[PDB]
């Protein structure tokens, strides 16, 4: 049995009680607790839980301010060591050197792990949640002063390290692959002739690849700070969730572009060619595990303007109808099949972010911030663990990069796509629907004929990659 400092000179030694900490019914899992108890466990001396550190650092701002968090971990770090024991006093009083058995044990089993864990929190804080520091300069000065006060040849390794990470973070990612990326594919449009780039002139395989690289980069850029507290749904969403919104807006624009390409091709035969090309792009998206790409296509095919084009879908080959149907099925029954498929593939992949947003929002609106026990308001940590489980799954899929070569011009083409032009949403959306009524009138109005608009061959080069280089 090891003695702890007096709860009178060190606040993190109060014993655990149903009034300051609650556990979830293999390390313990915290359901709720006071901020002091949460910090104690965040830096517990008995076991490790890097998972706790990420959860806490990702979600603490709703129950503790940055400045207060720093003050508390500094207090946690400053552990008073015990007084010599009776055996030591005897030795000291005889003029001998004390064995200090308990002092040495206390340092090895309590002080060292607690202080190392506090420093670990500081390191992860600065390395992965540096925005707290970018937004508050005094907080950073306090951190630097603290790390700079840490004495001892032992802690030296970590002090120097954290100091360097901090400096690196203030003044401002190579990739190695198992294999070599496949060769870029070209169809009608040739390299350098960006003016000719379009849905049917670029190779469908390369369209899916370049959009996958683009969508992957957008997905990988979303930080947890843009999600916690449901900030993307609030009035300052543009300020707090810029990367998320940019990712969603690209997806929306691409869906609208697919719809536009379809309804503006008035000639039935050419429209059938346009729809088939888009389904081939979906097929490559599936091969690449770009789920965001797959749903962009499904969303377009199920939009009001396109969904009603019976004469067009009637001419689509069965193998393609099947492909579209199976893609559509991923979202049915609340994405049941999509969730099963995502959990089974081999990354890299580009997940559909929508699911995550809804789950985070509901977790936050359906759980209380605090649980009350005997008049005490304990932080509801299980709520935070649930949100961090979601941000954690998002981060896991953000790690693996795609082994595909970027083609600058094609990438530029898609970055600048603007189907809506200068029109407002409602007007553009009404335009697409009116175009749909024009090209395929409601029954019993007869189907009119329209002149061709494409002067180049409409035959698709297919979706199987070629291999010459």
């Amino acid at each position: 049995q090891m003695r702890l400092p007096s709860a009178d000179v060190y606040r993190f030694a109060e014993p655990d009680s149903e009034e300051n900490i609650i556990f979830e019914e293999g390390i313990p899992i915290i359901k709720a607790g006071t901020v002091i108890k949460l910090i104690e466990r965040l830096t517990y001396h008995m076991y490790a839980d890097p998972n706790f550190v990420r959860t806490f650092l990702t979600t603490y701002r709703s129950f503790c301010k940055p400045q207060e968090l720093l003050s508390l971990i500094i207090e946690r770090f400053e552990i008073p060591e015990p007084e010599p024991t009776e055996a030591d006093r005897i030795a000291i009083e005889n003029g001998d050197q004390p064995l200090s058995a308990e002092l040495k044990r206390f340092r090895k089993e309590y002080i060292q792990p607690v202080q190392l864990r506090v420093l670990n929190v500081c390191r992860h804080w600065v390395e992965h949640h540096f925005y707290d520091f970018e937004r508050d300069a005094y907080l950073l000065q306090r951190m630097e002063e603290f790390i700079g006060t840490v004495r001892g040849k032992a802690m030296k390794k970590w002090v120097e390290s954290i100091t360097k990470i901090i400096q690196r973070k203030k003044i401002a990612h190579n990739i190695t692959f198992q294999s070599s990326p496949p060769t870029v594919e070209w169809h009608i449009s040739r390299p350098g002739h960006i003016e000719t780039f379009d849905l049917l002139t670029l190779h469908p395989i390369e369209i899916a690849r370049q959009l996958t690289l683009l969508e992957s980069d957008l997905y990988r850029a979303v930080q947890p700070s843009e999600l916690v507290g449901s900030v993307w749904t609030k009035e300052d969403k543009e300020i707090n969730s810029p990367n998320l919104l940019k990712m969603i807006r690209h997806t929306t624009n691409l869906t609208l572009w697919f719809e536009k390409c379809i309804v503006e091709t008035e000639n039935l035969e050419e429209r059938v060619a346009v729809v088939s090309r888009i389904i081939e792009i979906l097929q490559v998206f599936q091969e690449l595990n770009n789920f965001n790409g797959v749903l962009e296509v499904v969303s377009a095919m199920n939009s009001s303007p396109v969904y009603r084009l019976d004469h067009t879908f009637e001419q689509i080959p069965s193998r393609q109808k099947k492909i579209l149907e199976e893609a559509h099925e991923l979202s049915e029954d609340h994405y049941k099949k999509y969730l099963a498929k995502l959990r089974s593939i081999n990354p890299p992949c580009v997940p559909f972010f929508g699911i995550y947003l809804t789950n985070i929002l509901k977790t936050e609106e359906g759980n209380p911030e605090v649980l009350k026990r005997h008049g005490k308001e304990l932080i509801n940590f299980s709520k935070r663990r649930k949100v961090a489980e979601i941000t954690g799954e998002i981060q896991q899929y953000q790690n693996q990069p795609y082994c595909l070569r970027v083609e600058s011009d094609i990438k530029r083409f898609f970055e600048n796509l603007n189907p809506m032009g200068n029109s407002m949403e409602k007007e553009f959306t009404d335009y697409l629907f009116n175009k749909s009524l024009e090209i395929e009138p409601r029954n019993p109005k007869p189907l009119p004929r329209f002149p061709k608009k494409y002067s180049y061959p409409l035959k698709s080069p297919g979706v199987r990659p070629s291999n010459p280089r």
Partner: protein
């Protein structure tokens, strides 16, 4: 038994998710997990008739505006929600109704107008303005306070009645 597919639509931040949660979840359990299977279905008894409610709430995904048509086509009845302290969300209702009519290709779709009280900020849409809008559309108006659970059952049950009487 009959299953009713209900879709909750409206501007972001009006409390659509809280309504769904309040209707579905167990209000007598410490923790709620929306990632759990079928946390969107609830068996209920309405006017002595037992049925299964399947609720699609896309709160949080409002920015994916091009996915709206697809999400809406899955429903038989719709809850059109606005926040009583947010006039813009009230003014958006008209377009949501028109879009629902378009994707269901019918001028007579089962729906209920729902005004939700999200917090204690000042109300900007009065009961009469909303009642008049609902009357002009020929649909019921229900006011809720998802936070206190008032009117939640009423909003969904009223919608189911609209579906049964279509």
């Amino acid at each position: 038994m009959t299953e009713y597919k209900l879709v909750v639509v409206g501007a972001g931040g009006v409390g659509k998710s809280a309504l769904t949660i309040q209707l579905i979840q167990n209000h007598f359990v410490d923790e709620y997990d929306p990632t759990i299977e079928d946390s969107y279905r609830k068996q209920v008894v309405i006017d002595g008739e037992t049925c299964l409610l399947d609720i699609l709430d896309t709160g949080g995904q409002e920015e994916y505006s091009a996915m709206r048509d697809q999400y809406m086509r899955t429903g038989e009845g719709f809850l059109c929600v606005f926040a009583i302290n947010n006039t813009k969300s009230f003014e958006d209702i008209h377009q949501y109704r028109e879009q629902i009519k378009r994707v269901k290709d019918s001028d007579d779709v089962p729906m209920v107008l729902v005004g939700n009280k999200c917090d204690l900020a000042a109300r900007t849409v009065e009961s009469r303005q909303a009642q008049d809008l609902a009357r002009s559309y020929g649909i019921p108006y229900i006011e809720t306070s998802a936070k206190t659970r008032q009117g939640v059952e009423d909003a969904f049950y009223t919608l189911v009645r609209e579906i049964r009487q279509h």
